[PDB]
Design a protein around this motif. Structure first.
Motif, PDB file in Angstrom:
ATOM      1  N   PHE A  16    -114.252 137.797   8.725  1.00  0.00           N
ATOM      2  CA  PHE A  16    -114.850 139.124   8.540  1.00  0.00           C
ATOM      3  C   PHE A  16    -115.790 139.118   7.334  1.00  0.00           C
ATOM      4  O   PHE A  16    -115.503 138.482   6.312  1.00  0.00           O
ATOM      5  N   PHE A  76    -101.447 141.700   4.256  1.00  0.00           N
ATOM      6  CA  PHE A  76    -102.374 140.751   4.877  1.00  0.00           C
ATOM      7  C   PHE A  76    -103.270 140.265   3.729  1.00  0.00           C
ATOM      8  O   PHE A  76    -104.257 140.914   3.383  1.00  0.00           O
ATOM      9  N   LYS A 101     -98.514 137.784   4.335  1.00  0.00           N
ATOM     10  CA  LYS A 101     -99.099 137.468   5.635  1.00  0.00           C
ATOM     11  C   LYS A 101    -100.469 136.795   5.470  1.00  0.00           C
ATOM     12  O   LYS A 101    -101.280 137.209   4.633  1.00  0.00           O
ATOM     13  N   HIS A 103    -103.682 134.649   8.085  1.00  0.00           N
ATOM     14  CA  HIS A 103    -104.143 133.931   9.271  1.00  0.00           C
ATOM     15  C   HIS A 103    -105.021 132.732   8.908  1.00  0.00           C
ATOM     16  O   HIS A 103    -105.657 132.142   9.783  1.00  0.00           O
ATOM     17  N   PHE A 137    -107.028 143.162  21.598  1.00  0.00           N
ATOM     18  CA  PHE A 137    -107.079 143.460  20.166  1.00  0.00           C
ATOM     19  C   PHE A 137    -108.507 143.602  19.622  1.00  0.00           C
ATOM     20  O   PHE A 137    -108.789 144.534  18.878  1.00  0.00           O
ATOM     21  N   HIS A 144    -113.447 143.778  14.101  1.00  0.00           N
ATOM     22  CA  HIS A 144    -113.931 142.627  14.875  1.00  0.00           C
ATOM     23  C   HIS A 144    -115.308 142.890  15.471  1.00  0.00           C
ATOM     24  O   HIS A 144    -115.657 144.038  15.707  1.00  0.00           O
ATOM     25  N   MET A 243    -108.309 151.181  14.082  1.00  0.00           N
ATOM     26  CA  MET A 243    -107.611 150.767  15.299  1.00  0.00           C
ATOM     27  C   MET A 243    -107.432 151.923  16.274  1.00  0.00           C
ATOM     28  O   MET A 243    -106.729 152.894  15.974  1.00  0.00           O
TER      29      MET A 243
HETATM   30  O1  LIG Z   1    -107.749 145.051  11.734  1.00  0.00           O
HETATM   31  N1  LIG Z   1    -107.913 143.849  11.915  1.00  0.00           N
HETATM   32  O2  LIG Z   1    -109.050 143.412  12.094  1.00  0.00           O
HETATM   33  C1  LIG Z   1    -106.810 142.979  11.936  1.00  0.00           C
HETATM   34  C2  LIG Z   1    -105.529 143.464  11.648  1.00  0.00           C
HETATM   35  C3  LIG Z   1    -104.435 142.604  11.680  1.00  0.00           C
HETATM   36  C4  LIG Z   1    -104.624 141.258  11.997  1.00  0.00           C
HETATM   37  O3  LIG Z   1    -103.544 140.453  12.137  1.00  0.00           O
HETATM   38  C5  LIG Z   1    -105.897 140.764  12.285  1.00  0.00           C
HETATM   39  C6  LIG Z   1    -106.992 141.629  12.249  1.00  0.00           C
END
Ligand SMILES: O=[N+]([O-])c1ccc(O)cc1
Ligand SMILES: Nc1ncnc2c1ncn2[C@@H]1O[C@H](COP(=O)(O)O)[C@@H](OP(=O)(O)O)[C@H]1O
Ligand SMILES: O=[N+]([O-])c1ccc(O)cc1
Length: 289
Positions: A16, A76, A101, A103, A137, A144, A243
């Motif tokens: 991002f 996150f 958390k 990724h 998602f 995104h 979201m």
């Molecule tokens: O809001 N988001 O873009 C997210 C939120 C949670 C995640 O695990 C990945 C992306």
């Protein structure tokens, strides 16, 4: 508009725009020896395992685990969005023991985690179910870029041109890393089949022995049917701008094998041929049903 932007390369990986912009803050993150890092490729069971861990830390106390939304209870780390959130700062101000958390691909993880020799729980999920989950998602989670059609998104996923990069490299490299650091490497499919067995693995890894009754409490509250309706775990506390659950709920289906509903037979055959080439020189083994 912070939403729907193109991804930005960070050390070889599409992330991002706002993470890229604040990357030095992520790189310099200060881990602590008793941090537990939950590490996943997106859509692999991050929320599920995060809730399990918070339930373990609170001895199965459902009400204590509703003190705040999962994304505040288990920050996150690398997610920084101006005006919206800052995972690094949330964690900086959080008392130990912290559940963290991420990724991030292994090669991008802040080096403090390695220097502190933190315990890490990695969760993997079969690639076909991941890409389906990630497609919906992408639609609902507006940070995104536009996913396009299923067909377009599937091709992007295979090419690793999605947020956090290629699934293949993510799972393979984290698998190799288990030989260097304390990584409990779990599979979403195993947690589906025998959640009790997997939670027992987590407990052993954490060096915790708890009563069967508490184990059963944790099992009950971490089930899909409970979590899907739990506003502290199901992301419905997110603003619609971030979201939109009316597009696709975060707690979507919670099964293994939804790929069968999404993939055409041709897409499946093509995906498998590509998959074998990318994965045959790794000892990592998955189940798809
Ligand atoms: O809001 N988001 O873009 C997210 C939120 C949670 C995640 O695990 C990945 C992306
Ligand atoms: N308690 C639970 N049991 C089974 N699956 C769960 C779960 N909680 C979340 N999930 C599923 O895990 C995926 C989200 O993963 P992450 O938390 O890593 O983003 C979603 O998959 P689906 O989209 O296939 O339903 C979601 O429904
Ligand atoms: O605003 N958002 O889209 C968010 C914020 C926090 C989080 O962990 C995930 C997504």
């Amino acid at each position: 508009d912070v939403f729907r932007r193109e991804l930005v390369d960070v050390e070889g990986i599409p992330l991002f725009w706002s993470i890229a912009e604040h990357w030095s803050q992520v790189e310099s993150f200060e881990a602590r020896p008793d941090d537990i890092l939950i590490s996943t490729y997106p859509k692999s069971g991050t929320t599920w395992v995060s809730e399990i861990l918070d339930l373990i830390y609170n001895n199965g106390d459902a009400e204590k685990c509703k003190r705040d939304a999962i994304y505040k209870r288990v920050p996150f780390m690398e997610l920084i969005i101006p005006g919206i959130t800052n995972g690094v700062e949330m964690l900086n101000n959080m008392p130990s023991p912290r559940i963290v958390k991420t990724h991030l691909p292994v090669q991008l993880l802040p080096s403090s985690f390695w220097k502190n020799d933190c315990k890490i729980i990695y969760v993997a999920r079969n690639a076909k179910d991941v890409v389906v989950s990630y497609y919906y998602f992408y639609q609902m989670a507006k940070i995104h870029p536009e996913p396009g059609t299923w067909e377009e998104f599937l091709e992007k996923f295979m090419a690793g041109q999605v947020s956090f990069g290629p699934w293949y490299d993510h799972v393979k490299s984290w698998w190799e890393k288990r030989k260097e650091y304390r990584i409990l490497y779990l599979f979403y499919e195993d947690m589906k089949e025998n959640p009790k067995c997997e939670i027992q693995k987590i407990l052993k890894f954490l060096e915790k022995d708890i009563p069967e009754e508490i184990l059963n409490k944790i099992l009950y509250h971490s089930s899909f049917s409970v979590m899907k309706e739990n506003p502290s775990a199901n992301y419905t506390t997110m603003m619609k701008e971030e979201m939109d659950h009316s597009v696709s709920p975060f707690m979507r289906k919670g099964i293994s094998g939804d790929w069968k509903n999404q993939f055409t037979v041709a897409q499946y055959e093509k995906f498998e041929e590509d998959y074998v080439k990318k994965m045959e020189d790794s000892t990592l083994k998955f189940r798809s049903e």
